[PDB]
Amino acid sequence: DGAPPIMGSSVYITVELAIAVLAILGNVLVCWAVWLNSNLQNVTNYFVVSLAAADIAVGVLAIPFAITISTGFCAACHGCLFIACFVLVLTQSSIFSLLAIAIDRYIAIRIPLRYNGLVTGTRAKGIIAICWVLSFAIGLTPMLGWNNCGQPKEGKNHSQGCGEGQVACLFEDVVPMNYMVYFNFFACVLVPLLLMLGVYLRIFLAARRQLADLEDNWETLNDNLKVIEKADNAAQVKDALTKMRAAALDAQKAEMKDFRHGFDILVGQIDDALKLANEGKVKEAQAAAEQLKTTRNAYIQKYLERARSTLQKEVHAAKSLAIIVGLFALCWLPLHIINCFTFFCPDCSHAPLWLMYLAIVLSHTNSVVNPFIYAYRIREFRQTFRKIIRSHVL
Ligand SMILES: CC(C)CCC[C@@H](C)[C@H]1CC[C@H]2[C@@H]3CC=C4C[C@@H](O)CC[C@]4(C)[C@H]3CC[C@]12C
Ligand SMILES: CC(C)CCC[C@@H](C)[C@H]1CC[C@H]2[C@@H]3CC=C4C[C@@H](O)CC[C@]4(C)[C@H]3CC[C@]12C
Numbered sequence: 001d002g003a004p005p006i007m008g009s010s011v012y013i014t015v016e017l018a019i020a021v022l023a024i025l026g027n028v029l030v031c032w033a034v035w036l037n038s039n040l041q042n043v044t045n046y047f048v049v050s051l052a053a054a055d056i057a058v059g060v061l062a063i064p065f066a067i068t069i070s071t072g073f074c075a076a077c078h079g080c081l082f083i084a085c086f087v088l089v090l091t092q093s094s095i096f097s098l099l100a101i102a103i104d105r106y107i108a109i110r111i112p113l114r115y116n117g118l119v120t121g122t123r124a125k126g127i128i129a130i131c132w133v134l135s136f137a138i139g140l141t142p143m144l145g146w147n148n149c150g151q152p153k154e155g156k157n158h159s160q161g162c163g164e165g166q167v168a169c170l171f172e173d174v175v176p177m178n179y180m181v182y183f184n185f186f187a188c189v190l191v192p193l194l195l196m197l198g199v200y201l202r203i204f205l206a207a208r209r210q211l212a213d214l215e216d217n218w219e220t221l222n223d224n225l226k227v228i229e230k231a232d233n234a235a236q237v238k239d240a241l242t243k244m245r246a247a248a249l250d251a252q253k254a255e256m257k258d259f260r261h262g263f264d265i266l267v268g269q270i271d272d273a274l275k276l277a278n279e280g281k282v283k284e285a286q287a288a289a290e291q292l293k294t295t296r297n298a299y300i301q302k303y304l305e306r307a308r309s310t311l312q313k314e315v316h317a318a319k320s321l322a323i324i325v326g327l328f329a330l331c332w333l334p335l336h337i338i339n340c341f342t343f344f345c346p347d348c349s350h351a352p353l354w355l356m357y358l359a360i361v362l363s364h365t366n367s368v369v370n371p372f373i374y375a376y377r378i379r380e381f382r383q384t385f386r387k388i389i390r391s392h393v394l
């Protein structure tokens with residue numbers, strides 16, 4: 001018999017509405033930017049748009065649902081369940097989109113030549129539709145019978161004065177905690193998050209290995225070259241030539257590219273120097289191999305810098321997207337962890353109400369943050385945001 005509940009409720013409702021406004025506005029901007037700019041119309045950003053659509057729905061539907069269910073109003077139990085569980089559909093859809101983005105970037109760095117033929121917009125669209133259907137089936141599974149509708153709180157249902165077939169609509173009274181912990185958290189949230197962690201680990205390892213190979217081929221080119229100018233035997237020169245030749249066509253594997261001309265001059269100049277070396281013409285081999293360094297300084301170095309900056313851009317982009325996964329875990333793990341304490345420690349007092357609603361608010365603010373990550377970390381998004389804001393506002 002303490003403070004009137006409407007005072008704490010007013011703070012919670014006001015905060016939730018403030019979050020809904022920001023989740024809608026920022027994510028509308030993301031969709032608008034992708035619609036407007038053809039540089040943003042790729043497969044990766046179709047999952048970004050699906051993720052933005054889920055976050056718009058958090059503000060338009062899930063947050064009004066959250067406000068409604070906090071009152072504990074009388075409702076038919078299956079109507080209560082849909083109000084209580086709809087946010088899990090949107091959260092599961094976010095998981096699928098984040099997982100698809102990770103696999104997309106993994107395919108792009110592991111087999112870039114085959115990427116465009118394997119990962120197409122038509123297949124992406126079908127993957128998205130399937131993930132939304134599965135998200136409804138996973139998120140609304142309690143409506144299929146795994147619920148507490150058969151064991152109502154009669155004390156609460158008579159206090160509130162509910163009618164026949166009605167319950168006081170409270171989350172922890174209608175949704176069983178073993179579904180929430182075992183099915184939703186462990187299987188549907190925690191396992192995909194660990195998979196995303198593993199995929200991103202593989203992305204960074206593949207990039208580090210591909211940059212290391214590039215550097216080893218480059219040093220192999222210049223080491224064997226320095227050995228050429230120092231040798232005094234015909235076969236000693238031919239040995240540094242054959243090892244320079246393998247590294248040559250090795251780096252070649254890493255019609256609108258004038259780069260094959262650079263590698264054909266290089267490999268042809270090596271073979272010329274090889275034929276001299278086999279004929280004992282040492283000094284001719286050493287002089288014919290000395291013109292390699294201008295072919296290197298006019299073609300090979302230009303292509304090994306361009307391949308390096310492309311890999312660095314893929315690493316920077318993959319880090320930007322991994323931040324999105326980290327902030328998702330940050331905002332949703334407290335609620336899951338609180339549920340674990342409620343479920344696994346019956347000797348523990350229940351987490352207090354103010355902490356419950358702080359964790360609910362925290363999970364909702366995740367629907368606000370992604371547009372900020374795009375604006376700060378991805379230039380093409382930031383510049384498109386700027387144009388939209390300047391033009392279609394001021
Ligand atoms: C905006 C578009 C998607 C329509 C939104 C549908 C929402 C508002 C509708 C669809 C199903 C509806 C629920 C279905 C049944 C019940 C049980 C009843 O005892 C109280 C109302 C309640 C809880 C309804 C509340 C409103 C509801 C959730
Ligand atoms: C993911 C990051 C933010 C870590 C989150 C840590 C939070 C969720 C943890 C840290 C300390 C935890 C609390 C410590 C002890 C209790 C008392 C118990 O009777 C109910 C659970 C409760 C209230 C825990 C709830 C969850 C809790 C608040």
Ligand SMILES: CC(C)CCC[C@@H](C)[C@H]1CC[C@H]2[C@@H]3CC=C4C[C@@H](O)CC[C@]4(C)[C@H]3CC[C@]12C
Pocket residue numbers: 337340341344345
């Ligand atoms: C980063 C990933 C692994 C997060 C998962 C950590 C979870 C599963 C761990 C972290 C802290 C753990 C809790 C810490 C203490 C207790 C009290 C005990 O009487 C029941 C189990 C319970 C409630 C644990 C359940 C499992 C738990 C919630």
Ligand SMILES: Nc1nc(NCCc2ccc(O)cc2)nc2nc(-c3ccco3)nn12
Pocket residue numbers: 088170171172180335336339356360
């Ligand atoms: N445990 C829980 N409770 C609520 N709302 C009810 C908070 C509450 C708890 C006890 C009480 O007596 C009155 C109200 N929403 C909740 N959402 C979630 C959730 C969604 C996704 C993961 O956890 N868990 N969750």
Ligand code: NA
Pocket residue numbers: 051054055090091094366367
């Ligand atoms: Na989301």
